[PDB]
């Protein structure tokens, strides 16, 4: 058993607040905003030893990173950006920061009760996507 448990499993996008304004200052273009806002996607967790695999499976795209904690990844994102991502545990929240062309973008995921909360932030601009067990 490790802490990182709490976060298996599958889980089923239920909310999104400022997404669009997120995908703005990240650089996502008109068309794919339109469709990636729209999409509801399923997360799913697992861990094998020191391995997390995170994938996002949705009507857009289909996703998938795997990754040791605190070892750096080269990432192509769901808006084909070529970031290199660093994926850490701090005080039980999983902490990932990609870094692309001089640009930071950081998403943290919490359990916070029966949910897993999203919080994405681009310079001044958070937005927070809540995810429920599916
Ligand atoms: O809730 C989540 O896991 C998160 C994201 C998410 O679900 N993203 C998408 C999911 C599908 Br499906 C399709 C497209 C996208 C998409 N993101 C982007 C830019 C903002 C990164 N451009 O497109 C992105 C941040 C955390
Ligand atoms: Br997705």
Redesign the pocket.
């Known amino acids: 058993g490790s802490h990182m448990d709490a976060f298996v499993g599958t889980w089923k996008?239920v909310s999104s607040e400022n997404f669009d304004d997120?995908?703005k200052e990240?650089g996502?273009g008109f068309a794919?905003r339109k469709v990636?806002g729209m999409?509801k996607?399923n997360?799913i967790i697992s861990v094998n030893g020191d391995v997390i695999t995170i994938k996002?499976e949705?009507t857009?795209?289909n996703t998938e990173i795997s990754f040791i904690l605190g070892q750096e990844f080269d990432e192509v994102?769901?808006?084909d950006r070529k970031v290199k991502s660093t994926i850490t545990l701090d005080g039980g929240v999983l902490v990932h920061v990609q870094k692309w062309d001089g640009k930071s973008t950081t998403?943290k995921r919490k359990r916070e009760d029966d949910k897993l909360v999203?919080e994405?932030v681009m310079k001044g601009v958070t937005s927070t996507?809540v995810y429920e067990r599916a």
Do not use: E, G, N, Q
Request: charge should be positive.
């Open positions: 996008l997120y995908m990240v996502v794919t990636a999409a996607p997360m996002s949705s857009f795209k994102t769901a808006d998403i999203v994405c996507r």
